[PDB]
Design a protein around this motif. Structure first.
Motif, PDB file in Angstrom:
ATOM      1  N   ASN A   1       0.854  -1.177   0.000  1.00  0.00           N
ATOM      2  CA  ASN A   1       0.000   0.000   0.000  1.00  0.00           C
ATOM      3  C   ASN A   1       0.897   1.236   0.000  1.00  0.00           C
ATOM      4  OD1 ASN A   1      -0.515  -1.338   3.134  1.00  0.00           O
ATOM      5  ND2 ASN A   1       0.600   0.618   2.966  1.00  0.00           N
ATOM      6  N   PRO A   2       0.341   2.429  -0.191  1.00  0.00           N
ATOM      7  CA  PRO A   2       1.172   3.640  -0.170  1.00  0.00           C
ATOM      8  C   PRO A   2       1.924   3.829   1.150  1.00  0.00           C
ATOM      9  CG  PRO A   2      -0.949   4.104  -1.185  1.00  0.00           C
ATOM     10  CD  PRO A   2      -1.040   2.716  -0.624  1.00  0.00           C
ATOM     11  N   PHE A   3       3.038   4.568   1.062  1.00  0.00           N
ATOM     12  CA  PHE A   3       3.898   4.827   2.220  1.00  0.00           C
ATOM     13  C   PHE A   3       3.108   5.328   3.426  1.00  0.00           C
ATOM     14  CE2 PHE A   3       6.687   7.659   4.728  1.00  0.00           C
ATOM     15  CZ  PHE A   3       7.749   6.813   5.011  1.00  0.00           C
ATOM     16  N   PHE A   4       2.158   6.234   3.198  1.00  0.00           N
ATOM     17  CA  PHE A   4       1.396   6.831   4.291  1.00  0.00           C
ATOM     18  C   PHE A   4       0.398   5.874   4.928  1.00  0.00           C
ATOM     19  CE2 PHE A   4       1.862  11.415   2.543  1.00  0.00           C
ATOM     20  CZ  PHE A   4       2.960  11.629   3.336  1.00  0.00           C
ATOM     21  N   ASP A   5       0.128   4.717   4.321  1.00  0.00           N
ATOM     22  CA  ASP A   5      -0.917   3.826   4.805  1.00  0.00           C
ATOM     23  C   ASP A   5      -0.388   2.721   5.712  1.00  0.00           C
ATOM     24  OD1 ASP A   5      -2.713   5.378   3.442  1.00  0.00           O
ATOM     25  OD2 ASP A   5      -3.098   3.927   1.837  1.00  0.00           O
ATOM     26  N   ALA A   6       0.897   2.739   6.042  1.00  0.00           N
ATOM     27  CA  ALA A   6       1.436   1.803   7.022  1.00  0.00           C
ATOM     28  C   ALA A   6       1.060   2.261   8.425  1.00  0.00           C
ATOM     29  CB  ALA A   6       2.954   1.703   6.898  1.00  0.00           C
ATOM     30  N   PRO A   7       0.295   1.477   9.184  1.00  0.00           N
ATOM     31  CA  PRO A   7      -0.046   1.877  10.554  1.00  0.00           C
ATOM     32  C   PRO A   7       1.172   1.780  11.453  1.00  0.00           C
ATOM     33  CG  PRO A   7      -1.425   0.047   9.746  1.00  0.00           C
ATOM     34  CD  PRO A   7      -0.243   0.152   8.848  1.00  0.00           C
ATOM     35  N   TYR A   8       1.193   2.610  12.501  1.00  0.00           N
ATOM     36  CA  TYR A   8       2.379   2.605  13.348  1.00  0.00           C
ATOM     37  C   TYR A   8       2.599   1.250  14.018  1.00  0.00           C
ATOM     38  CZ  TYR A   8       6.126   3.748  16.433  1.00  0.00           C
ATOM     39  OH  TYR A   8       7.364   3.755  17.047  1.00  0.00           O
ATOM     40  N   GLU A   9       1.530   0.524  14.368  1.00  0.00           N
ATOM     41  CA  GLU A   9       1.733  -0.792  14.973  1.00  0.00           C
ATOM     42  C   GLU A   9       2.614  -1.673  14.090  1.00  0.00           C
ATOM     43  N   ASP A  10       2.442  -1.571  12.770  1.00  0.00           N
ATOM     44  CA  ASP A  10       3.249  -2.369  11.850  1.00  0.00           C
ATOM     45  C   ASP A  10       4.667  -1.825  11.750  1.00  0.00           C
ATOM     46  OD1 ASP A  10       1.000  -3.891  11.494  1.00  0.00           O
ATOM     47  OD2 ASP A  10       0.622  -3.289   9.419  1.00  0.00           O
ATOM     48  N   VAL A  11       4.804  -0.509  11.583  1.00  0.00           N
ATOM     49  CA  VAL A  11       6.128   0.104  11.531  1.00  0.00           C
ATOM     50  C   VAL A  11       6.903  -0.197  12.805  1.00  0.00           C
ATOM     51  CG1 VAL A  11       7.368   2.301  11.411  1.00  0.00           C
ATOM     52  CG2 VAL A  11       5.358   1.881   9.922  1.00  0.00           C
ATOM     53  N   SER A  12       6.243  -0.063  13.960  1.00  0.00           N
ATOM     54  CA  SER A  12       6.912  -0.312  15.232  1.00  0.00           C
ATOM     55  C   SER A  12       7.412  -1.748  15.325  1.00  0.00           C
ATOM     56  CB  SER A  12       5.972   0.003  16.393  1.00  0.00           C
ATOM     57  OG  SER A  12       6.599  -0.269  17.644  1.00  0.00           O
ATOM     58  N   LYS A  13       6.624  -2.716  14.842  1.00  0.00           N
ATOM     59  CA  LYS A  13       7.097  -4.097  14.841  1.00  0.00           C
ATOM     60  C   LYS A  13       8.340  -4.248  13.976  1.00  0.00           C
ATOM     61  CE  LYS A  13       5.856  -8.875  13.905  1.00  0.00           C
ATOM     62  NZ  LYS A  13       4.762  -9.857  13.671  1.00  0.00           N
ATOM     63  N   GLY A  14       8.338  -3.628  12.789  1.00  0.00           N
ATOM     64  CA  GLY A  14       9.508  -3.695  11.926  1.00  0.00           C
ATOM     65  C   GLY A  14      10.738  -3.034  12.524  1.00  0.00           C
ATOM     66  N   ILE A  15      10.561  -1.890  13.189  1.00  0.00           N
ATOM     67  CA  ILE A  15      11.712  -1.226  13.795  1.00  0.00           C
ATOM     68  C   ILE A  15      12.217  -2.025  14.994  1.00  0.00           C
ATOM     69  CG2 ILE A  15      12.395   0.858  15.092  1.00  0.00           C
ATOM     70  CD1 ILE A  15      10.742   2.501  13.154  1.00  0.00           C
ATOM     71  N   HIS A  16      11.305  -2.644  15.742  1.00  0.00           N
ATOM     72  CA  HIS A  16      11.705  -3.518  16.842  1.00  0.00           C
ATOM     73  C   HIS A  16      12.646  -4.614  16.348  1.00  0.00           C
ATOM     74  CE1 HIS A  16      10.215  -5.804  20.699  1.00  0.00           C
ATOM     75  NE2 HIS A  16      11.531  -5.747  20.609  1.00  0.00           N
ATOM     76  N   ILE A  17      12.225  -5.345  15.317  1.00  0.00           N
ATOM     77  CA  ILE A  17      12.986  -6.500  14.855  1.00  0.00           C
ATOM     78  C   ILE A  17      14.226  -6.074  14.076  1.00  0.00           C
ATOM     79  CG2 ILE A  17      12.878  -8.493  13.309  1.00  0.00           C
ATOM     80  CD1 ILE A  17       9.826  -8.679  14.123  1.00  0.00           C
ATOM     81  N   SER A  18      14.117  -5.022  13.263  1.00  0.00           N
ATOM     82  CA  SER A  18      15.189  -4.667  12.335  1.00  0.00           C
ATOM     83  C   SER A  18      16.235  -3.743  12.934  1.00  0.00           C
ATOM     84  CB  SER A  18      14.608  -4.003  11.085  1.00  0.00           C
ATOM     85  OG  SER A  18      13.596  -4.837  10.523  1.00  0.00           O
ATOM     86  N   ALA A  19      15.876  -2.939  13.940  1.00  0.00           N
ATOM     87  CA  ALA A  19      16.801  -1.938  14.458  1.00  0.00           C
ATOM     88  C   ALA A  19      17.031  -2.060  15.962  1.00  0.00           C
ATOM     89  CB  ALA A  19      16.291  -0.529  14.111  1.00  0.00           C
ATOM     90  N   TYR A  20      15.975  -2.011  16.782  1.00  0.00           N
ATOM     91  CA  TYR A  20      16.176  -2.065  18.229  1.00  0.00           C
ATOM     92  C   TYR A  20      16.866  -3.358  18.646  1.00  0.00           C
ATOM     93  CZ  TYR A  20      15.031  -2.204  23.254  1.00  0.00           C
ATOM     94  OH  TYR A  20      15.081  -2.328  24.633  1.00  0.00           O
ATOM     95  N   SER A  21      16.556  -4.466  17.964  1.00  0.00           N
ATOM     96  CA  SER A  21      17.122  -5.746  18.360  1.00  0.00           C
ATOM     97  C   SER A  21      18.630  -5.804  18.159  1.00  0.00           C
ATOM     98  CB  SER A  21      16.453  -6.882  17.587  1.00  0.00           C
ATOM     99  OG  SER A  21      16.880  -6.868  16.238  1.00  0.00           O
ATOM    100  N   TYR A  22      19.216  -4.892  17.375  1.00  0.00           N
ATOM    101  CA  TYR A  22      20.677  -4.840  17.331  1.00  0.00           C
ATOM    102  C   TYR A  22      21.235  -4.446  18.697  1.00  0.00           C
ATOM    103  CZ  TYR A  22      25.368  -4.206  15.458  1.00  0.00           C
ATOM    104  OH  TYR A  22      26.720  -4.316  15.204  1.00  0.00           O
ATOM    105  N   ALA A  23      20.600  -3.474  19.361  1.00  0.00           N
ATOM    106  CA  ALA A  23      20.973  -3.162  20.739  1.00  0.00           C
ATOM    107  C   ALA A  23      20.639  -4.315  21.684  1.00  0.00           C
ATOM    108  CB  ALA A  23      20.287  -1.872  21.191  1.00  0.00           C
ATOM    109  N   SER A  24      19.456  -4.934  21.530  1.00  0.00           N
ATOM    110  CA  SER A  24      19.055  -6.044  22.403  1.00  0.00           C
ATOM    111  C   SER A  24      20.061  -7.182  22.356  1.00  0.00           C
ATOM    112  CB  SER A  24      17.686  -6.589  21.973  1.00  0.00           C
ATOM    113  OG  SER A  24      16.666  -5.647  22.158  1.00  0.00           O
ATOM    114  N   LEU A  25      20.489  -7.543  21.143  1.00  0.00           N
ATOM    115  CA  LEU A  25      21.415  -8.657  20.970  1.00  0.00           C
ATOM    116  C   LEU A  25      22.772  -8.335  21.579  1.00  0.00           C
ATOM    117  CD1 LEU A  25      21.679 -11.444  19.696  1.00  0.00           C
ATOM    118  CD2 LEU A  25      22.516 -10.294  17.616  1.00  0.00           C
ATOM    119  N   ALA A  26      23.245  -7.105  21.374  1.00  0.00           N
ATOM    120  CA  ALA A  26      24.500  -6.672  21.977  1.00  0.00           C
ATOM    121  C   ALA A  26      24.410  -6.643  23.498  1.00  0.00           C
ATOM    122  CB  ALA A  26      24.883  -5.292  21.433  1.00  0.00           C
TER     123      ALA A  26
END
Ligand SMILES: NC(=O)c1ccc[n+]([C@@H]2O[C@H](COP(=O)([O-])OP(=O)(O)OC[C@H]3O[C@@H](n4cnc5c(N)ncnc54)[C@H](O)[C@@H]3O)[C@@H](O)[C@H]2O)c1
Length: 267
Positions: free
Chosen positions: A104-129
């Motif tokens: 869907n368009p960039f603006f139609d991603a709900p934050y719940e979905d974006v937040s899940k992606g940032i959790h797994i793709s970015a925050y977890s680099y700190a978590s793993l370290a």
């Protein structure tokens, strides 16, 4: 071998086209002793781990599971032996719901979905370290996988935002890891036909998302002075192993580009 005697934990195997499968394969061929982690489909992943050059244990890690993370160091130590420590950690973990990747368009991603992606793709680099630095040796190395997000790519939408966050997290992890004698860096790879990305270019998120990735791939090969092979992650795997070795001992907080040089040219 380049990694003789090193003990290295590798996340992120899900198929035999996963970048992490090739990291693990090349690392073992370079003399490393591995611990693999897998998310959810542990029987599926175990059968892939069975095809690596050498036998290595597989343990479970869902980076959204606090208990998995809080027990990870203990569970790694159970595999490598009390008193032994890790020399290397590979973060090869990424996820973004389809709403954040072009269905869907960039603006139609709900934050719940974006937040899940940032959790797994970015925050977890700190978590793993955080979880593994207490059992890492001086001289050790944490490496994560990046996809250069310095310019907007409509081919990847919110995954690119997550990679921008990951690059920032890497610089802070370098600060935390330094006092342990441990380096933290990312390897920014060009596009690779992993199973998920082969699906997108194949049309699973619609015709438009398929063409957007195909255009990105085609420009990449045109720009890269040494070429870029999206069907062979071996050069990326070798680069990760270079950073896991003792040969870049003054490099931390940075991004190393294993992308054929495409990021350095403008046509
Ligand atoms: N494929 C490319 O074009 C490309 C290019 C540059 C960088 N990268 C990055 O390389 C890394 C590896 O991705 P890949 O291309 O090999 O794809 P992949 O689909 O083979 O691997 C992604 C991995 O993330 C894991 N994962 C997802 N949710 C998880 C969770 N909750 N806990 C733990 N693991 C979880 C999956 O199980 C899988 O093993 C990712 O960070 C990706 O963004 C990929």
């Amino acid at each position: 071998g380049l990694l003789d005697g090193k003990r290295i934990l590798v996340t992120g195997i899900i198929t035999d086209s996963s970048i992490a499968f090739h990291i693990a394969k090349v690392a073992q061929e370079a003399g490393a002793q591995l611990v693999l982690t897998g998310f959810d489909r542990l029987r599926l992943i175990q059968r892939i781990v069975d095809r690596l050059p050498e036998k290595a244990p597989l343990i479970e890690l869902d980076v959204q599971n606090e208990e998995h993370l809080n027990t990870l160091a203990q569970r790694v130590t159970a595999e490598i032996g009390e008193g032994n420590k890790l020399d290397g950690v590979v973060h090869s973990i990424g996820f973004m719901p389809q709403t954040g990747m072009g269905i869907n368009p960039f603006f139609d991603a709900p934050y719940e979905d974006v937040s899940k992606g940032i959790h797994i793709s970015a925050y977890s680099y700190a978590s793993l370290a955080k979880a593994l630095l207490p059992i890492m040796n001086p001289g050790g190395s944490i490496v994560g996988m990046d996809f250069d997000p310095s310019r907007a790519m409509p081919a990847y939408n919110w995954m690119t935002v997550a990679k921008s966050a990951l690059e920032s997290v890497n610089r802070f992890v370098a600060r935390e890891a330094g006092p342990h004698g441990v380096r933290s860096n990312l390897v920014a790879a060009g596009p690779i036909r992993t199973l998920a990305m082969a699906g997108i270019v194949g049309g699973v998120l619609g015709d438009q998302a398929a063409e957007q990735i195909r255009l990105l791939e085609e420009g990449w090969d045109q720009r890269a002075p040494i070429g870029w092979n999206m069907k062979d992650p071996t050069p990326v795997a070798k680069t990760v192993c270079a950073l896991l070795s003792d040969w870049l001992p003054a490099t931390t907080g940075t991004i190393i580009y294993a992308d054929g040089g495409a990021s350095t040219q403008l046509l």
